[PDB]
Design an enzyme around this catalytic site. Structure first.
Site, PDB file in Angstrom:
ATOM      1  N   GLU A  35     115.250  29.845   9.188  1.00 37.29           N
ATOM      2  CA  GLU A  35     115.599  29.346  10.980  1.00 37.29           C
ATOM      3  C   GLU A  35     114.234  30.623  12.274  1.00 37.29           C
ATOM      4  O   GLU A  35     114.656  29.996  13.085  1.00 37.29           O
ATOM      5  CB  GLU A  35     117.041  31.324  11.039  1.00 37.29           C
ATOM      6  CG  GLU A  35     118.274  30.323  10.340  1.00 37.29           C
ATOM      7  CD  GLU A  35     118.509  29.101  11.534  1.00 37.29           C
ATOM      8  OE1 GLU A  35     118.066  29.063  12.387  1.00 37.29           O
ATOM      9  OE2 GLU A  35     119.057  28.161  10.941  1.00 37.29           O
ATOM     10  N   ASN A  46     119.328  26.368  24.174  1.00 38.81           N
ATOM     11  CA  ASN A  46     120.337  24.476  23.632  1.00 38.81           C
ATOM     12  C   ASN A  46     120.409  24.561  25.410  1.00 38.81           C
ATOM     13  O   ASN A  46     121.571  24.739  24.983  1.00 38.81           O
ATOM     14  CB  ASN A  46     121.201  24.966  22.479  1.00 38.81           C
ATOM     15  CG  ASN A  46     120.688  25.956  21.406  1.00 38.81           C
ATOM     16  OD1 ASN A  46     119.948  25.593  20.792  1.00 38.81           O
ATOM     17  ND2 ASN A  46     121.954  26.514  20.842  1.00 38.81           N
ATOM     18  N   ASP A  49     123.869  22.613  25.683  1.00 42.81           N
ATOM     19  CA  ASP A  49     125.409  22.704  25.478  1.00 42.81           C
ATOM     20  C   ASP A  49     125.438  24.005  25.747  1.00 42.81           C
ATOM     21  O   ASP A  49     126.811  25.155  26.055  1.00 42.81           O
ATOM     22  CB  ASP A  49     126.067  22.765  24.328  1.00 42.81           C
ATOM     23  CG  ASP A  49     125.973  23.984  23.239  1.00 42.81           C
ATOM     24  OD1 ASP A  49     124.632  24.005  22.999  1.00 42.81           O
ATOM     25  OD2 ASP A  49     125.919  24.750  22.418  1.00 42.81           O
ATOM     26  N   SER A  51     123.519  26.785  25.184  1.00 42.63           N
ATOM     27  CA  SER A  51     123.883  27.900  23.893  1.00 42.63           C
ATOM     28  C   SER A  51     122.416  28.496  24.009  1.00 42.63           C
ATOM     29  O   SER A  51     121.744  28.027  24.197  1.00 42.63           O
ATOM     30  CB  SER A  51     125.130  27.311  23.138  1.00 42.63           C
ATOM     31  OG  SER A  51     124.481  27.051  21.710  1.00 42.63           O
ATOM     32  N   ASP A  53     120.779  30.954  20.744  1.00 41.34           N
ATOM     33  CA  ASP A  53     120.441  31.172  19.194  1.00 41.34           C
ATOM     34  C   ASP A  53     120.083  32.572  19.322  1.00 41.34           C
ATOM     35  O   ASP A  53     118.925  32.533  19.949  1.00 41.34           O
ATOM     36  CB  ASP A  53     119.783  30.296  18.208  1.00 41.34           C
ATOM     37  CG  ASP A  53     120.367  28.864  18.096  1.00 41.34           C
ATOM     38  OD1 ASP A  53     122.174  28.304  18.352  1.00 41.34           O
ATOM     39  OD2 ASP A  53     119.830  27.876  18.018  1.00 41.34           O
ATOM     40  N   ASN A  60     124.222  31.989  16.980  1.00 44.12           N
ATOM     41  CA  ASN A  60     124.550  30.667  18.026  1.00 44.12           C
ATOM     42  C   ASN A  60     125.938  31.491  18.642  1.00 44.12           C
ATOM     43  O   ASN A  60     127.082  31.375  18.598  1.00 44.12           O
ATOM     44  CB  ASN A  60     125.018  29.796  18.304  1.00 44.12           C
ATOM     45  CG  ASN A  60     124.970  28.532  18.681  1.00 44.12           C
ATOM     46  OD1 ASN A  60     126.311  28.410  19.678  1.00 44.12           O
ATOM     47  ND2 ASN A  60     123.560  28.477  19.465  1.00 44.12           N
TER      48      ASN A  60
END
Length: 130
Positions: A35, A46, A49, A51, A53, A60
């Site tokens: 990750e 992102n 959308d 968002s 992380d 998220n």
């Protein structure tokens, strides 16, 4: 902070992650590795959308932490996303535990499915004293 492998393995163990909800420490290591490269400051926006992380586990904003700029988002861990960017991983671990208390468990993270599920993850904790 970018953790060294065994340093993190022991840090996670002390925080109660070894076998939490049936998830071994080696799985958690394989997750953090893929990750963020064990980097607590890691972030990934992102654009699709809106968002983002956050942290070592790349949690998220749409569902887990509040950053104030994610449309119709939730904050299931009841933490500011900022809390997931600390060198101290206590809050990120509490939130990681929150994620897995849900039906999918560790499967919530697509990276875990891609690079950890049904694989030999023993190498992640070998020699760490955990």
């Amino acid at each position: 902070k970018v953790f060294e492998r065994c340093e993190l393995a022991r840090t996670l163990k002390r925080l109660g992650m070894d076998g939490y909800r049936g998830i071994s420490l080696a799985n958690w290591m394989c997750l953090a590795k893929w990750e963020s490269g064990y980097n607590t400051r890691a972030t990934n926006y992102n654009a699709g959308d809106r968002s983002t992380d956050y942290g070592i586990f790349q949690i998220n904003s749409r569902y887990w932490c509040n950053d104030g700029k994610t449309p119709g988002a939730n904050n299931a861990c009841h933490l500011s996303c900022s809390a997931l960017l600390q060198d101290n991983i206590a809050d990120a671990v509490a939130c990681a535990k929150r994620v897995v208390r849900d039906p999918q468990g560790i499967r919530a993270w697509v990276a875990w499915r891609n690079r950890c599920q049904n694989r030999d993850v023993r190498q992640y904790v070998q020699g760490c004293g955990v």
